[PDB]
């Protein structure tokens, strides 16, 4: 045999692996949180885009904190050793460190160590990519004119939002953050490693999109994405 | 254009 490098993860597997997509749109009114309007389209061309990349796409509508946790414990507990890696899109309200479920909030440190490389051992080597479309807190951007591992290794969060910031959706054309995701998927994934596909996605979203709003609190405000990268390879969705 |  030649001389090996192994910078980057193993994708050949029999399987690309899950990829559970989340899709809180209508919440309990008690909870006092708005409808979604647009989570749809988001969901719809996030199942599109995955499914292209040989993802095994799960989507669930609207579930409750338990639920949330439920779903997350028992995907964790299936076998996925014929699996190259794992997905997991969240779209609901947020706030930093939170994602609600239709009835409460669910802490996203809970959803995320059902999968620590000792919790999840058929996936403990491979990336777990959470991708995340929820508010970080309340704060806008006004712009400016221009051998053993680490539990938390090999965890990616691409998150929609930087830390303590709102997270724009679009009623009619879906998420500023999973539309710009999408496309750069759709455009680049049999070309660029992850981290430069997620770069595109964080220049396409700072530059193209701006809010529009009668009030002017929430008028002409920018958003910047913000990858989280505890991975320990180079990812390539082909191979 | 909408908050989450």
């Known amino acids: ?239 | 254009d909408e908050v989450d």
């Open chain 1, 1 to 239: 045999s030649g001389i090996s490098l192994d910078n980057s993860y193993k994708m050949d597997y029999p399987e690309m692996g899950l990829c559970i997509i989340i899709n809180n749109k209508n919440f309990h009114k008690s909870t006092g949180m708005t409808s979604r309007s647009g989570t749809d389209v988001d969901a719809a061309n996030l199942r599109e885009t995955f499914r292209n990349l040989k993802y095994e796409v799960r989507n669930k509508n609207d579930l409750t904190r338990e639920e949330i946790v439920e779903l997350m414990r028992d995907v964790s507990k299936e076998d996925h050793s014929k699996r190259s890696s794992f997905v997991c899109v969240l779209l609901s309200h947020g706030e930093e460190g939170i994602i609600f479920g239709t009835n409460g909030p669910v802490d996203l440190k809970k959803i995320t160590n059902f999968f620590r490389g000792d919790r999840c051992r058929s996936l403990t080597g491979k990336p777990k990519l959470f991708i995340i479309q929820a508010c970080r807190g309340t704060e806008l951007d006004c712009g400016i004119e221009t051998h053993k591992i680490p539990v938390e290794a090999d965890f990616l969060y691409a998150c929609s939002t930087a830390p303590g910031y709102y997270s724009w959706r679009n009623s009619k054309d879906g998420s500023w953050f999973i539309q710009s995701l999408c496309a750069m998927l759709k455009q680049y994934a049999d070309k660029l490693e992850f981290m430069h596909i997620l770069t595109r996605v964080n220049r396409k979203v700072a530059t193209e999109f701006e809010s529009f709003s009668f009030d002017a609190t929430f008028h002409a405000k920018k958003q910047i994405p913000c990858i989280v990268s505890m991975l320990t390879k180079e990812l390539y969705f082909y191979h």
